[PDB]
Input
Amino acid sequence: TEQLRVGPGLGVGPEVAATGGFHQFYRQLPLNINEYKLTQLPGRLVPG
Amino acid sequence: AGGLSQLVAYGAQDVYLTGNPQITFFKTVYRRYTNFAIESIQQTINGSVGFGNKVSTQISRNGDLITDIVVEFVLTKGGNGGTTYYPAEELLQDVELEIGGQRIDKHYNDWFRTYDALFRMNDDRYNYRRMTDWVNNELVGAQKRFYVPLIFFFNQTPGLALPLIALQYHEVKLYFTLASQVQGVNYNGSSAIAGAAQPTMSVWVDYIFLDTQERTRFAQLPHEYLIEQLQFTGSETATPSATTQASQNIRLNFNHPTKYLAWNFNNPTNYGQYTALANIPGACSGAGTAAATVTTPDYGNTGTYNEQLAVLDSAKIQLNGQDRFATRKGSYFNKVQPYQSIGGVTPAGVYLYSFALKPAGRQPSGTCNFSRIDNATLSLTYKTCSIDATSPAAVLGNTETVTANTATLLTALNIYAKNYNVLRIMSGMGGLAYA
Amino acid sequence: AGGLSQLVAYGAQDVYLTGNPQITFFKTVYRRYTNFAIESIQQTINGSVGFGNKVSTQISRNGDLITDIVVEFVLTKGGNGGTTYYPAEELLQDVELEIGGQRIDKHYNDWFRTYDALFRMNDDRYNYRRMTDWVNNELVGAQKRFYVPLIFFFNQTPGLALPLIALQYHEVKLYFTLASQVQGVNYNGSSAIAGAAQPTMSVWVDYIFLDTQERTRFAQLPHEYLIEQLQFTGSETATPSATTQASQNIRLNFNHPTKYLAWNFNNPTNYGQYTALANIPGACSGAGTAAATVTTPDYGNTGTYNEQLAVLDSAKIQLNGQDRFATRKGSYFNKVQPYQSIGGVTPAGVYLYSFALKPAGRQPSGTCNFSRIDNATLSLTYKTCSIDATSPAAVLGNTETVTANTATLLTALNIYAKNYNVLRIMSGMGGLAYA
Amino acid sequence: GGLSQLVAYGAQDVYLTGNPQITFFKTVYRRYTNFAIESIQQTINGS
Amino acid sequence: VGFGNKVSTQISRNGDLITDIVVEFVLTKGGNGGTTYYPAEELLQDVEL
Amino acid sequence: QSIGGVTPAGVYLYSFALKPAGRQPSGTCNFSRIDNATLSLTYKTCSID
Amino acid sequence: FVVVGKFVEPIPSNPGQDFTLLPMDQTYT
Output
């Protein structure tokens, strides 16, 4: 066989043996669950 | 020789500091500013003044803008030195700020105590104590005028002065609640002090008088101010015991971009008591001697930096069930957070967690917007209350995870959040942008 | 009447302050900033933690930038209150900062002590002590967690947050040396304390998580940072004697634009001892009593402001054989220098000479470039050690040029220099521009 | 962790971080004129 | 506020329209049951708009 | 104000409506657009024999 | 996409030799 020996590094296809060194740039943020359950009501005034 | 011998020692590494210079430190150009004047004007207080009463005042239109507000109180000691603890602060139970008929903010005596304990420091903190307590060993009957500066955003920087001038159709009011009792003034622990004087109260507002063009601009142009607000809810503490480490998940009903959270545990009976009582100097009434009783604090020394008497073992904040940061010990929140973010010293039992680089400043420096967080939770772990508080050795020589048996008296939990909002003022009216 | 009466009192002498005004004080503008979040994350320590051991950690790539670093220790008391002195600091003998395999910087326990002595102050200093020592009269067996902040250039401000994200192909490491002995923890003077516990250690790094705009720019663009470094050379003191004023000329093997020099004399036996021991109330173990000895300090009170116990009579710095400034007395370096330039209070035995207007700040403000000085030398004159330290009258009533006979124990000299270098980062790699 | 705060972005954040003007992580130091400071004893006239 | 005193209030602009007004009072019994008759009503001697 | 009947001790009502006894509605509070609703209670001291 | 430049710095005073530290992009498909 060829014995590929893939290295570290995520966020890319299998064609890349290594992408990052000690700190890869790829980062993922959480989906911020229940974001629709927040209304964000504005403020209003009273009759002067 | 002399200073010239240093100037000659010039090379490549100096270019980064002094090449193509932009400034000089030896010539300062001061900025020309507008013409203004400041006047201290007394406000009229409606409603009977006395302990436990609710009174109010409307801020007069003497100037164009307002900044500092200081509340004066006159109290007489109901007992000897060592019997009071920040009594003027205790007395001003709360204050509401209403602009245009809308609540803008609200502070509580405990916030003033927490705020001071956490954000003031050094000589400013001492001068503050001098204006709210008796600190020169005064005796029973001593009369003193106290000053309790308010800490609303417009009372912290002139930059956020309220433009009464731009609020032509809107009133600005302060509502004050006076405590039913003040320790060492009209009550001693649970007992009333017969004959105690009722407070004399007066509210002072420092007004800014602007010159012709600046006044014109304020009156006619729209303004928006980025201001601070305090969010606050009182909770029941998952009180620890000699037999267990209590823990508690507290869902935080907070909103808005938050600079920081602050909290404390306390004995609701004894104002400002954030720590357990013990027979060690200052930790209880009579501490260190035969009369030491670990049921009542040495009121004049109620606060302490002695962590052993604190009850928080560890804590974390979770957002939507996910850890915000790794769990840290109570001393992290008490000593490290303030070191990093404030630079002062925080008393045991008072905790801070900042979402901001510099939460003590006016300028936002990173916030946690809870208006976009479904479930914000503060997770607390408490210390084990197994130490016999009447035995100094038991207290002073013990381990990290334990505290005094008297620490179970700290059953009240106060959680605060300091956030930003926007005060929009225009066309004679104003209020806050967000709810 | 009132404030308006001041506004109208306007004329020619006011033009310089308010004519053609540029600014106001009553309307502030906060600047909008790039979105980020800060998280405190625990690192993994390799090597065995214990007294005298060397351990290390590679800072993980969890966030983008790093700022504060805190090394936590859990220590126990091997004796009663008064037997320790900032033991967390004594324990952390040194910390070395390595980036890309290059030594960027390195701190020593003595520097942490010197640094504190010169730059922290007021309640910052007190809160700082609370995190490194036992300050509430704790007893033998007591256990506490200590927090020793690191003081590398990036640990003092977000402004220099190290862009780990821009260092894609380089390691960032901390190497920590733990002292073989810590006073009042595992040793008492020269005596080991049987049963003493080994320290528990944990090191935390505060990470900055950037939003996309900046996370992208930091990763893609080159960077340059003007940073500070500590240079340190240890040497022997021209030990003074009752029969003579010792003098010494120490060639200073320093380089780079130096913000300031700092130094102290010490008894290497006792961490933080920069002064002589004496039978005056706070200067020695048992001082003021029949048990007083001037061979051992009251450790909890090791530091002092009593210059009578210090050994520097006078000093000057020569550059290439030429006097930099006229010779000044030791008290100039101990009291005046920091008054004028820092604003804190420096303990006896610690000296500062600044080349900078603000040695305590980040902004360069005048430096002495030692990379261009073939021979810089520190010239010292010592006090005469003829005062009988066991007699408080002898000490307290002495003269300017003399000190304690026990001042001859301060045989070690530590000379520090803080300088400015340039950190450059490009294409995932970096290091410092000058050697 | 910290990423969970970054994502909590809403209408109220435009005032603090929208159209950002500054950052906190790149201090720009002012370049200044080169100088040195020396403490020199003066002659005092009169007894 | 007290017996025989005249007090007044100006209504704050805390909303657009107003309806109900409730005057709260705290009174105590100066004697036993059977001694009072609608005492809070008696107390509020009159109200002028 | 809202119903016109008499409620026994221990039973409490808070209306977000002018007339909660009707069908219309007169008015409502939409809790589906409120993220943190809470009822805050203070209890009496249980000391009476 | 990384930006590699020349790093404009002042001329060295005494020597002309220094450490280059060429950029490298460690990634292998």
